[PDB]
From a paper:
There has been a long quest for the structure of the poxvirus DNA polymerase holoenzyme since it has been shown that processive DNA synthesis by VACV E9 requires a cofactor composed of VACV A20 and the viral uracil-DNA glycosylase (UNG), D4. The polymerase E9 is a member of the DNA polymerase family B possessing DNA polymerase and 3’-5’ proofreading exonuclease activities. E9 on its own was shown to be distributive under physiological conditions, adding only few nucleotides per binding event. We present the production in the baculovirus-insect cell system of the VACV DNA polymerase holoenzyme, which consists of the E9 polymerase in combination with its co-factor, the A20-D4 heterodimer.
Here, we present a system for the production of the VACV E9-A20-D4 holoenzyme and its 3.8 Å structure obtained by single particle cryo-EM. Surprisingly, the structure showed a conformation, where the processivity factor A20-D4 was folded back onto the polymerase subunit creating the D4-E9 interface described for the MPXV holoenzyme in presence of DNA. The parts of the complex where previous high-resolution structures were available were very well defined so that E9, the D4/A201-50 complex and the NMR structure of A20304-426 could be fitted into the density. The Alphafold 2 prediction of A20 could be fitted reliably into the electron density after adjustment of the relative orientation of the domains A201-50, middle domain and A20304-426 although for the final structure a model based on the very similar structure from MPXV has been used. The side chains of D4 E32 and E9 S177, as well as D4 R39 and the main chain carbonyl of E9 L278 could be involved in hydrogen bonds (dotted lines). The thumb domain of E9 is disordered in the cryo-EM structure, whereas it is stabilized in the crystal structure due to a contact with a neighboring molecule. Surprisingly, the apo structure of the VACV polymerase holoenzyme believed initially to represent an inactive state induced by the cryo-EM sample preparation showed a closed conformation similar to the MPXV structure with bound template, primer strand and incoming nucleotide.
Author numbering:
A (entry chain A): 2 to 279, 285 to 426
B (entry chain E): -3 to 306, 313 to 829
C (entry chain D): 1 to 218
The structure:
C-alpha cells in the first residue's frame, strides 16, 4: 500500500532480474524480500532458491560450429581463453560460473575491481578468467560504453586486459577458419584462445564462434608442473610430446583420465584441450593410487608431502619470510592490518589457510578422529573412524596431519605471543 | 438511593466510541449493581532521553526509576570469544497518553494497555475497594465519573460475597435434513433458565405456535399452557408459555437486553444467539440492541471469531458492551479440556456420574435410590441436583434409559428408569448420549412431541447452570482476573502468550528489567518430534507410578535458564574443534557458577551445541517460576486451613489457575510469537529435563534391595557439575532385613516414571513406595528437585501414553481394599 | 454464454462458461434467499443482479473487489456511474490520471480493461443503506468470490474495514492487496499506490501489467 512497499517490490523484482549475477548477500536479500512479500500479500509469483544458477547466456547466443556470414557495422574483437571463469559484480565478489562459490582473490585484483566499479555506475559486471594462477580480465559489458574505455581504465589500473581489436566490415564475406586464424594471430598472444567474442556498436548481445574438430591420441603420463609456492599444475603429454591443456584438477577428476590409455581431444591451430563429460569417489582415489599415495589434494593442485613449515605461514600472511618464530611477531606490530587479519580469524582458520587444506575433506577426516588437548594445544590424536580412509584426501591429509597439528600449535602460541 | 462504597468487581470492559473509556460493572453487598467510568488512555515507556526529546508534551507521564535494559539476543559462537551480554542501565518513564502518539523508539510494546492500567493504578481486578465519593462524580443513574483511579481505589476491603444474576438460555430449531438455517429452518422451541438476584431459579420454556396447529394450540392451552401473543403480556413464573415466532423473538429481545451479570450457553455465540439475531431481523426490523450503562453508545449484536495457534480451532465472541460477560461453554471448555469428545453428552457423562444401588426389580421400569453414602459424600447431592430436569440416564455407561419418575429430597434421589430388570449389585448412572431423535420428532411434529421436546430443551439449557457451578467457572474466572491481570470478560478469550504478559510485567516492574530485541527471529520451532515407546505392554507385577513436581517449572528455577542468563551458545563443525571448545569451556567458565549443557545441534553441519548459562543471579523467568510454584503451594496449603465452603471454592480456583499458568511457561519460552522467547532457553530446558529423566531411569533400573540397604545399578552422582553428596549407590533402607527386592524401570515420558517391583503384593508396593519417596527426596534428587509417588498398577496393560488400563491401588488403601479400575481409550 | 433459471427473478441468469462450476450452488442459494431479498428495493434492480456473470475470466487477472453496489444509481456494473458522477470512480479516475498523466478525460469504466474485472462482494444493498442486505447474500458472495479467486491473479479491495477478514472466507491463498476505499478520510486513497503495486506484483507473477488507461473514455 505504501510507496515504501512499492520500492521494496521494485528492488525485489530487480534482484529477481539479476539473480544469475548474484552472490550470497543478494540471495539473502532476495529471500528476505520474498518472505516479506508473501507474508504481506499472501502470495508471490517468486519463491526461494538456494543453488543459484549463474549464467550470462542472456548476453550471448548459440555458438557457431561452422562458417557463417557477417556484413553490417563495425566489430570489436575480444578473445576467449582457457581456465576457470569468474564474474565480479557491484558490491559482490568473484564467483565461479555454474557452481558459484566465494573464491579467494588477492587484494591488488580486488582493489582494481573496486576502483574500476566505483568510477561510474554503468557497469553490469567484470568478467575474469583464471589460468595457471594468472588473473586475466577478459571482458566487461555495459549498456552505455564499450569494452575499450573500461579496458583502458583497467590497463592503467594495473590489471591485464586483452588487446581489443576494432575492425569495420563492408562486403559480404563468409567468416571461416582462415579469417578466424587471421584475427587470432592479430591478437598476438601465446595464451590459449578457444573462441572469439566480437561485438557491434549498439548491440547489447554478444555472440561468439568456435571452430574445432575431433582428434584422438594416447596418454602417456599425468604429471604436475610447478606453477607456484606449494602449487603444482597436473599435466599430460603425448608420444610426440604435445601438451594437452587443463583448467582445474576438478576437470581432471570429471574426465576420468586413465593412465596409459587413449583420449578424445578437440585440437586447435595452436593448442589442444581434452574434453570433459566422460564416480568422483572412484576417480579421486584411482588417479592418486596411479600417481602415488604421497600426493594430496592441495586445493586445485597436487602436491607432495607438503612438509610446510614457518615460512608457509609467512607466505599466506604475506609477511617477511622468516625461519624464526621470534620474527613472526616483530613486524606484525608494525603491520597495521596483518595483525587485524590474524586476530579476526580463528586459530583453525589460519591453520587451514596456511596448509592448502580442502574444507570438506579435512572436516570429515577430523570428525572421524579422537584428540587429546592440553593448554589449548593438541598433544595427541587418534583415528575414530577408518571408513573415511576410503577417501584418498582423508588419508593423504592424515599423512601430514602431523604438519597440520604442528602448524596449528604454532598458530595458537602465535596468538598467545601476539597477546604478549 | 445512596451509593454503597463497598463494591466488588464482577466485570470489566473497554469502550468502542470516539472517546473511549473504561466502564467497570461492580456489585455492592446490599444488592446494587453500579457502574464507574474510567477514562482510558494509551501506555508507553521510553528511556528518559526520549522522554526529554519530545517537544509536544505528553498528556501525563510517570517515571519508573533507573531500570537496566537487557539485550536478549542469541548469538552462536564457534569459539570462546563470547561477548558480554548487552546491559544498559537507564531511567524509564511511563506516559499516559490519550491518542496513539506512535513513537519510533518506545519500549515495552508487546503487552496490552489494560494490564498497564491495572498495574499503574494498583487496581486489583477482583479486588473489593471502598470507593471515594469525592473521587466519584455521578454522571448517569448508576454511572459515575472517576478521573483518578489511584485515589479512588484507596481503601481495599476483605472479600465478601454477592448475589449474582446468572442468566442462561438455549433453544432448538426445526431443521429439515441439513443444518437448521435462519432463513429456511424455523425455531422449534426456546428454553431459558433465568436466575435473578433473588436466587429464584425461574423457568419458562417457550414453544413455537407457528409450526403447530391452532387446534393443537387450543388443546395445549386447555392442558395447562398459557398463550400470549405480544411482548407486554408475558409473565415469567409459568413454564410453558406459548406464542408465535414474532412474539418469541420480541420477548427474547426484551430478555437479552437485560442488564444481566452473566449469560451462559453451549455453542451459543456461533449457532444459537446469532440464530436469534438473524431470524429476528428476517421477520422483524429490530436488531438486538445492547447499550452502554452511561447511555452514550449503542452497538448492535456482533458475531466475530478470533483464531489461535499453539489442531485448528476458532472461538466465537460478541462485543456487546451492556455489562454482561456474554460467556459460552463450548469454546471455554474446549480450552480447559483435552478430551475424546466435547459433545455435550460426553461432558455431562464426565461431570455428573453417581453410583447406584438397586431398589426395585421387575419389568422394564426399575426404581433406584442413591443416598449421600451410596457412592461418596458429595456425588449424591450434585447428581440429585441435576436430576431435577433431565430425562435420560446412561446406566452402566451403556444402558441409556429414560427417566420415568424421579424423587429427590435433599441429599439423594429415587428414580424410576426404563431399563430392563436384571439382578445386579449396583449400577453407574450417567448422562451420556441422549436417546431422542429430534430429527424424527420434527419430521412428525405434533403437540405431545412439542411438549416433550420443550422439556428436552429446558434440560439442555438448565445443564448450563449445573456445569457453571461444577466447573466452577465463576470461581476460575475470578481467579483469572487477579492472576493474569485482565478483565474478567477476557480471562478465557485471549491466547496464552498474551495472558502470561500480566504477571511477567509485574515482575519486570519489580526487578526493573526490560527485555528488548533489535534482531529478527529465525524460522525453527522448539520441538524435534520426540517419540516414546514402552518397554512392554502386559505387566505381571505391580508398577510404582512416580511423578515429577512441575518438571520444567522447577528446572527453570534450578539452572536459572532464561534470556538474560544465557551468555552464549557454542558450536563447532568438526570433532577436533568440538573437543577443543569442550575443554576450553570447561576451563574458562568454572562450576558451580555456570553450567555446561548439551543441546541438539540446530543445523545439519553442526554436531555439538554447548549452551552456557550463569546462575549468578536468579533472572526474571526463573524468579517468576519460583514465585508461581511457591504461591501454588501456599494456596494449596490454605485450601486445608479454612472451613467456609466459599473458601473451598476460591482457593481451589486460585490453586488450579496457578497450575495452568505455571505449567505452560516452557511453551511460551520456545514459542517464536511469545514475549518469553529465547531459543537456547527452551532447548536447554528440554535438554535438562531429558537428562533428569534418563538419570532417574538409570537410578531405578537395575536397583535391588539388599537386605536392609538399597543397592542401585548406578551411583547417586550429580549429572550437571561437581557434587558433594554421598554418591554411594548403597543407601540405608528403613525396612526389615527380610526384604530383598529389585526394581526394573519400565517407562517414563516427561514427568511420570513407571517403576516395576518384583512382586504382585500391592501392599508391599505401597510400603516400599512410601520409603522410596523419602529415599529419593533425601538422597538421589538434589537442590530443589522433588517428586511424589502417584500410584501402583497391578495387572497393568498399557499400549502407549494414552491407551492403557490397569487396577490402580491408592496409597491410602491396602491389598484388601477397593482399587481404582482405569480404562481409557475404550470404544 | 449460458443462462439458467432460478425460482424467482430474473428466472434467467446468463453467465460465461468460466462461471459454469458455480451455477448449481448459486441457483440453490438464490432460490433460498430470493423472496426475503425481494422484501426491499435494490440498487441495481433485481433484474440486473446477474450482469456480472456474463463477463469471462480466463483473460482476467487483476480483480478489483468492491464490497457492495451503490445505494443509488445501482446499475450492476461495479463502481460504475452512467454519467460518471460517483465520488468513488471520480477518485479512481483521479489516481489513474496521476499515475498516467491523463489531464483531460470524461469518464472511467473499470469494465473495459483486459485483465481487470470490477467485482461486487454483496450483490445488492437496500435503498440508501449499506451492507444491510449482506445477510441474505453471504453464501452467494462467498461462492462468487471463491470461484473468482480460482483464476484471478490479484485481489484488490477498496475499504480496509469492510474487507477486514476477506482472507478467511477465501481458502486458496492469492495475491491480495487491501487498499483504502475512495470514501476514505483525508484523501488517503489519493495517497494509495495500489495500481502501481498491482502492476509490479503482476510482473512478479510474470503477468501482464494493467493498462488502466484503457478504462478511460474521452
Amino acid at each position: 500500500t505504501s510507496s515504501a512497499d512499492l520500492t521494496n517490490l521494485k528492488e525485489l523484482l530487480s534482484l529477481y532480474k539479476s539473480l544469475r549475477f548474484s552472490d550470497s548477500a543478494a540471495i539473502e536479500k532476495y529471500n528476505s524480500l520474498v518472505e516479506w512479500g508473501t507474508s504481506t500479500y499472501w502470495k508471490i509469483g517468486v519463491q526461494k532458491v538456494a543453488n543459484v544458477e549463474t549464467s550470462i547466456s542472456d548476453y550471448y547466443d548459440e555458438v557457431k560450429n561452422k562458417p557463417f556470414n557477417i556484413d553490417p557495422g563495425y566489430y570489436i574483437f575480444l578473445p576467449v581463453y582457457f581456465g576457470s571463469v569468474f564474474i565480479y559484480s557491484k558490491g559482490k565478489n568473484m564467483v565461479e560460473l555454474g557452481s558459484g562459490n566465494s573464491f579467494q582473490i588477492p587484494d591488488d585484483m580486488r582493489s582494481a575491481c573496486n576502483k574500476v566499479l566505483d568510477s561510474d555506475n554503468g557497469i553490469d559486471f567484470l568478467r575474469f578468467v583464471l589460468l595457471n594462477n594468472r588473473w586475466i580480465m577478459e571482458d566487461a559489458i555495459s549498456k552505455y560504453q564499450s569494452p575499450v574505455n573500461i579496458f583502458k581504465l583497467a590497463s592503467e589500473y594495473g590489471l591485464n586486459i586483452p588487446k581489443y581489436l576494432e575492425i569495420e566490415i563492408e562486403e559480404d564475406t563468409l567468416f571461416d577458419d582462415e579469417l578466424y586464424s587471421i584475427i587470432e594471430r592479430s591478437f598476438d598472444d601465446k595464451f590459449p584462445k578457444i573462441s572469439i567474442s566480437y561485438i557491434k556498436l549498439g548491440e547489447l548481445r554478444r555472440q561468439v564462434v568456435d571452430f574445432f574438430k575431433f582428434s584422438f591420441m594416447y596418454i602417456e603420463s599425468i604429471k604436475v608442473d610447478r606453477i607456484g609456492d606449494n602449487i603444482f599444475i597436473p599435466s599430460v603429454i603425448t608420444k610426440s610430446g604435445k601438451k594437452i591443456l587443463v583448467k582445474d584438477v576438478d576437470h581432471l577428476i570429471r574426465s576420468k583420465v586413465r593412465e596409459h590409455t587413449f583420449v578424445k581431444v578437440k585440437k586447435k591451430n595452436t593448442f589442444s584441450i581434452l574434453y570433459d563429460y566422460d564416480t568422483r569417489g572412484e576417480v579421486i582415489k584411482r588417479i592418486i593410487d596411479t600417481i602415488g599415495r604421497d600426493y594430496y589434494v592441495n586445493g586445485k593442485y597436487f602436491s607432495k608431502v607438503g612438509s610446510a613449515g614457518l615460512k608457509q605461514l609467512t607466505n599466506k600472511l604475506d609477511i617477511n619470510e622468516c625461519a624464526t618464530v621470534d620474527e613472526l611477531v616483530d613486524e606484525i606490530n608494525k603491520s597495521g592490518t596483518v595483525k587485524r587479519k590474524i586476530k579476526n580469524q580463528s586459530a583453525f582458520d589460519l591453520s587451514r589457510e596456511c596448509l592448502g587444506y580442502p574444507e570438506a575433506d579435512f572436516i570429515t577426516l577430523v570428525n572421524n578422529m579422537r584428540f587429546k588437548i592440553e593448554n589449548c594445544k593438541v598433544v595427541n590424536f587418534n583415528i575414530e573412524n577408518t571408513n573415511c580412509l576410503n577417501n584418498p584426501s582423508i588419508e593423504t591429509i592424515y599423512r601430514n596431519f602431523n604438519q597440520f597439528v604442528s602448524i596449528f600449535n604454532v598458530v595458537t602460541d602465535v596468538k598467545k605471543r601476539l597477546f604478549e | 438511593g445512596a451509593m454503597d462504597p463497598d463494591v466488588r468487581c464482577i466485570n470489566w470492559f473497554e469502550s468502542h466510541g470516539e472517546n473511549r473509556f473504561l466502564y467497570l460493572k461492580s456489585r455492592c453487598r446490599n444488592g446494587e449493581t453500579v457502574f464507574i467510568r474510567f477514562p482510558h488512555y494509551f501506555y508507553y515507556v521510553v528511556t528518559d532521553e526520549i522522554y526529554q526529546s519530545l517537544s509536544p508534551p505528553p498528556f501525563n507521564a510517570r517515571p519508573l526509576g533507573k531500570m537496566r535494559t537487557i539485550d536478549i539476543d542469541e548469538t552462536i559462537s564457534y569459539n570462546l570469544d563470547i561477548k558480554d551480554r548487552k546491559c544498559s542501565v537507564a531511567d524509564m518513564w511511563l506516559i499516559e497518553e490519550p491518542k496513539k502518539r506512535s513513537i519510533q523508539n518506545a519500549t515495552m510494546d508487546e503487552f496490552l494497555n489494560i494490564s498497564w492500567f491495572y498495574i499503574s493504578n494498583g487496581i486489583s481486578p477482583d479486588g473489593c475497594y471502598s470507593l471515594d465519593e469525592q473521587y466519584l462524580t455521578k454522571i448517569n443513574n448508576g454511572c459515575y465519573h472517576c478521573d483518578d483511579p489511584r485515589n479512588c481505589f484507596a481503601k481495599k476491603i476483605p472479600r465478601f460475597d454477592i448475589p449474582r444474576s446468572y442468566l442462561f438460555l438455549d433453544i432448538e430449531c426445526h431443521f429439515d435434513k441439513k443444518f437448521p438455517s435462519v432463513f429456511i429452518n424455523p425455531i422449534s422451541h426456546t428454553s431459558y433458565c433465568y436466575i435473578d438476584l433473588s436466587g429464584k431459579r425461574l423457568l419458562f420454556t417457550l414453544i413455537n405456535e407457528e409450526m403447530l396447529t391452532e387446534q393443537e394450540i387450543q388443546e395445549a392451552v386447555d392442558r395447562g399452557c398459557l398463550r400470549i401473543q405480544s411482548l407486554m403480556e408475558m409473565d415469567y413464573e409459568r413454564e410453558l408459555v406459548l406464542c408465535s415466532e414474532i412474539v418469541l423473538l420480541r420477548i427474547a429481545k426484551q430478555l437479552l437486553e437485560l442488564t444481566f451479570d452473566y449469560v451462559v450457553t453451549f455453542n451459543g455465540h456461533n449457532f444459537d444467539l446469532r440464530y436469534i439475531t438473524n431470524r429476528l431481523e428476517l421477520l422483524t426490523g429490530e436488531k438486538i440492541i445492547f447499550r452502554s450503562p452511561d447511555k452514550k453508545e449503542a452497538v448492535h449484536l456482533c458475531i466475530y471469531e478470533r483464531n489461535q495457534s499453539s489442531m485448528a480451532n476458532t472461538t466465537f465472541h460478541v462485543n456487546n458492551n451492556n455489562g454482561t460477560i456474554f460467556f459460552d461453554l463450548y469454546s471455554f471448555i474446549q480450552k480447559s479440556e483435552k478430551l475424546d469428545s466435547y459433545k455435550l453428552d460426553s461432558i455431562s457423562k464426565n461431570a455428573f456420574s453417581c453410583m447406584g444401588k438397586v431398589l426395585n426389580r421387575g419389568v422394564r421400569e426399575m426404581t433406584f435410590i442413591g443416598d449421600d453414602t451410596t457412592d461418596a459424600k458429595g456425588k449424591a447431592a450434585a447428581f440429585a441436583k441435576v436430576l431435577t430436569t433431565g430425562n435420560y440416564v446412561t446406566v452402566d455407561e451403556d444402558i441409556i434409559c429414560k427417566v420415568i419418575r424421579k424423587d429427590i429430597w435433599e441429599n439423594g434421589f429415587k428414580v424410576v428408569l426404563l431399563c430392563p430388570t436384571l439382578p445386579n449389585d449396583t449400577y453407574k448412572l450417567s448422562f451420556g448420549k441422549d436417546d431422542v431423535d429430534l430429527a424424527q420428532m420434527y419430521k412428525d411434529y405434533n403437540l405431545n412431541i412439542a411438549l416433550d421436546m420443550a422439556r428436552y430443551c429446558i434440560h439442555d439449557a438448565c445443564l448450563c447452570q449445573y456445569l457453571w457451578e461444577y466447573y466452577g467457572v465463576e470461581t476460575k474466572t475470578d481467579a483469572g482476573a487477579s492472576t493474569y491481570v485482565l478483565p474478567q470478560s477476557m480471562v478465557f478469550e485471549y491466547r496464552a502468550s498474551t495472558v502470561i504478559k500480566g504477571p511477567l510485567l509485574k515482575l519486570l516492574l519489580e526487578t526493573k528489567t526490560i527485555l528488548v530485541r533489535s534482531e529478527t527471529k529465525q524460522k525453527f520451532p522448539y520441538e524435534g518430534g520426540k517419540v516414546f515407546a514402552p518397554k512392554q505392554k502386559m505387566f505381571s507385577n505391580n508398577v510404582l507410578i512416580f511423578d515429577y513436581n512441575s518438571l520444567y517449572p522447577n528446572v527453570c528455577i534450578f539452572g536459572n535458564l532464561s534470556p538474560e542468563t544465557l551468555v552464549g551458545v557454542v558450536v563447532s563443525t568438526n570433532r577436533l574443534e568440538e573437543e577443543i571448545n569442550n575443554q576450553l569451556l570447561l576451563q574458562k567458565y568454572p562450576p558451580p557458577r555456570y553450567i555446561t549443557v548439551h543441546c541438539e545441534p540446530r543445523l545439519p553441519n553442526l554436531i555439538s551445541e554447548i549452551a552456557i548459562f550463569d546462575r549468578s543471579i536468579e533472572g526474571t523467568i526463573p524468579r517468576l517460576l519460583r514465585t508461581f510454584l511457591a504461591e501454588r503451594a501456599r494456596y494449596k496449603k490454605m485450601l486445608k486451613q479454612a472451613t467456609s465452603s466459599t473458601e473451598k471454592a476460591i482457593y481451589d480456583s486460585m490453586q488450579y489457575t496457578y497450575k495452568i499458568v505455571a505449567n505452560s511457561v516452557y511453551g511460551l519460552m520456545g514459542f517464536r510469537n511469545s514475549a518469553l522467547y529465547s531459543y537456547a532457553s527452551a532447548k536447554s530446558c528440554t535438554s535438562i529435563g531429558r537428562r533428569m529423566i534418563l538419570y532417574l531411569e538409570s537410578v531405578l533400573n537395575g536397583a535391588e534391595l539388599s537386605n536392609g540397604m538399597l543397592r542401585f545399578a548406578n551411583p547417586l552422582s550429580n549429572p550437571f557439575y561437581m557434587d558433594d553428596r554421598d554418591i554411594n549407590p548403597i543407601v540405608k533402607t528403613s525396612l526389615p532385613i527380610d526384604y530383598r527386592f529389585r526394581f526394573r524401570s519400565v517407562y517414563g515420558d516427561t514427568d511420570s516414571v513407571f517403576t516395576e517391583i518384583d512382586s504382585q503384593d500391592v501392599d508391599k508396593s505401597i510400603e516400599i513406595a512410601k520409603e522410596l519417596e523419602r529415599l529419593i527426596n533425601n538422597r538421589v534428587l538434589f537442590n530443589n528437585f522433588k517428586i511424589e509417588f502417584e500410584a501402583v498398577y497391578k495387572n497393568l496393560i498399557m499400549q502407549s501414553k494414552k491407551k492403557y488400563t490397569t487396577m490402580k491401588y491408592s496409597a491410602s488403601s491396602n491389598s484388601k481394599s477397593v482399587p481404582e479400575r482405569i480404562n481409557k481409550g475404550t470404544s | 454464454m449460458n443462462s439458467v433459471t432460478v425460482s424467482h427473478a430474473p428466472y434467467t441468469i446468463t453467465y460465461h462458461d468460466d462461471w459454469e462450476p458455480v451455477m448449481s450452488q448459486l441457483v440453490e442459494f438464490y432460490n433460498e434467499v430470493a423472496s426475503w431479498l425481494l422484501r426491499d428495493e435494490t440498487s441495481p434492480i433485481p433484474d440486473k443482479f446477474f450482469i456480472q456473470l456474463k463477463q469471462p475470466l480466463r483473460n482476467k487477472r487483476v480483480c478489483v473487489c468492491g464490497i457492495d453496489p451503490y445505494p443509488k444509481d445501482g446499475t450492476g456494473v461495479p463502481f460504475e456511474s452512467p454519467n460518471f458522477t460517483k465520488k468513488s470512480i471520480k477518485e479512481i479516475a483521479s489516481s489513474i490520471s496521476r499515475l498516467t498523466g491523463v489531464i483531460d478525460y470524461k469518464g472511467y469504466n473499470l469494465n473495459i480493461i483486459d485483465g481487470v474485472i470490477p467485482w461486487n462482494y454483496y450483490l445488492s444493498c437496500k435503498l440508501g443503506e449499506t451492507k444491510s442486505h449482506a445477510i441474505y447474500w453471504d453464501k452467494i458472495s462467498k461462492l462468487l468470490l471463491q470461484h473468482i479467486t480460482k483464476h484471478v491473479s490479484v485481489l484488490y479491495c477498496l475499504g480496509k474495514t469492510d474487507f477486514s477478514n476477506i482472507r478467511a472466507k477465501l481458502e486458496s491463498p492469492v495475491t491480495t492487496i487491501v487498499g483504502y476505499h475512495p470514501a476514505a478520510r483525508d484523501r488517503q486513497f489519493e495517497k494509495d499506490r495500489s495500481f502501481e503495486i498491482i502492476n509490479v506484483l503482476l510482473e512478479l507473477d510474470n503477468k501482464a501489467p494493467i493498462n488502466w488507461a484503457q478504462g478511460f473514455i474521452y
